[PDB]
Design a protein around this ligand. Sequence first.
Ligand SMILES: CC1(C)CC(=O)C(SC[C@H](NC(=O)CC[C@H](N)C(=O)O)C(=O)NCC(=O)O)C(=O)C1
Ligand SMILES: CC1(C)CC(=O)C(SC[C@H](NC(=O)CC[C@H](N)C(=O)O)C(=O)NCC(=O)O)C(=O)C1
Lengths: 218, 223
Amino acid sequence: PKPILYYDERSPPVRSCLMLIKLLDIDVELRFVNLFKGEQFQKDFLALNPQHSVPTLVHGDLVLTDSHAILIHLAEKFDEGGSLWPQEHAERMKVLNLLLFECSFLFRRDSDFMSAIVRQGFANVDVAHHERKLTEAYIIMERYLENSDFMAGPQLTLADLSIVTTLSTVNLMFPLSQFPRLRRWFTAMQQLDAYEANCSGLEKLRQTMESVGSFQFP
Amino acid sequence: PKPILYYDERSPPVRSCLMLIKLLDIDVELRFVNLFKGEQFQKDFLALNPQHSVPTLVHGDLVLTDSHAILIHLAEKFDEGGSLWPQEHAERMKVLNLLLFECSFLFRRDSDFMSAIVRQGFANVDVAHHERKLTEAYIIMERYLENSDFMAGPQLTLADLSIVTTLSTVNLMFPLSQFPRLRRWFTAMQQLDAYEANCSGLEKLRQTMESVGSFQFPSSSAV
Ligand SMILES: CC1(C)CC(=O)C(SC[C@H](NC(=O)CC[C@H](N)C(=O)O)C(=O)NCC(=O)O)C(=O)C1
Ligand SMILES: CC1(C)CC(=O)C(SC[C@H](NC(=O)CC[C@H](N)C(=O)O)C(=O)NCC(=O)O)C(=O)C1
């Protein structure tokens, strides 16, 4: 049966999966779960994913509850022989390493920041604190890009898809003007056909944040 | 070339790799990085890992900066065809899925709690808040173990090694009395020879945390 993606396109890790679906032309059935209404706490979704998180993928009997597992799974089933998830071990480990960096460091810090706005109101967030945490992520990715057109090497991989959606979200608040490699990479990413799938949810997140946080992004 | 593991055994994700190294009898050179003295900010280590995090593995010219990639890399190179990182696609996806649960949810929440203690002192931490966050993680893992007999399936996998080190760290603070499957599973993990690689760093974490946080964990909590 075709895969099913439970999703809220405001979420960075959802948008990474939407970009891969568009890049690989995967026929998928989308099911919207409204996180700001708490629809992730509906009893049947919680039964499916007790982490109450999106993206969640149901593909046959397989239930994946993390965008990085979904990215890898979809590339393995639908892009065998592709370069997005390279077959050579050392290259695949480098892509895996950067996907985990996205989860563990970039997304963690952006999520901490944005959740603080949601839950405290923008005016009550220590923006300087989060600016330092997130500028440090920028600095790290700028080094990752030294002598490398893309995050994990010379070609576009799953790591770029994961990182670009969160990066574009950080960039709602903090500009890339100080990071030339990272700003050129982001411009290049924005020229992908598949980047179209990031646009709609990023703007929806911008609008939802500004409403719930009682503020406007620079 | 022999793998080099930059490590602080107090760190849960370090201990998961140490468990795999002992379980597979991998010869690895250990290089200590004292997180509580800020040695992860020495210029040479930042050059190697700009996230200034342990575990960091150097194996040949491959540099891995996340425990879950290290676990997968070491299983592929030293447990080829094994069942820790299974070859069947759906089974491997389930292990990967739970490795990411440990990264995204359990460790995130345990790290947030313990970092708050380090930065604020235990008496200034909203312990009730973190108790809610972490008990929710217990509930989730109990549900996983209601469906299977290990975290990602019927056999031991990398997911159990990743999850048990953080589980044991959470359980320094919060008891497992109300969680029978998780107690049964935890007791089974404690029977593995490889669990020795978790016991020592866990105790050092307990002692350092009590010093820095000016508190004591409830001795009755730990299983
Ligand atoms: C305010 C903001 C930006 C806060 C967020 O964190 C997100 S992302 C939505 C979130 N999804 C995950 O946390 C999955 C992370 C995994 N590592 C992965 O799939 O990669 C989510 O579902 N939250 C719902 C909840 O926790 O109840 C966001 O969209 C809004
Ligand atoms: C107080 C406590 C428990 C806080 C912690 O978070 C840790 S773990 C040490 C930490 N390592 C990582 O964050 C790696 C996470 C990756 N997803 C992975 O490898 O799996 C670390 O190195 N911190 C140093 C720093 O950030 O400066 C801990 O040990 C202490």
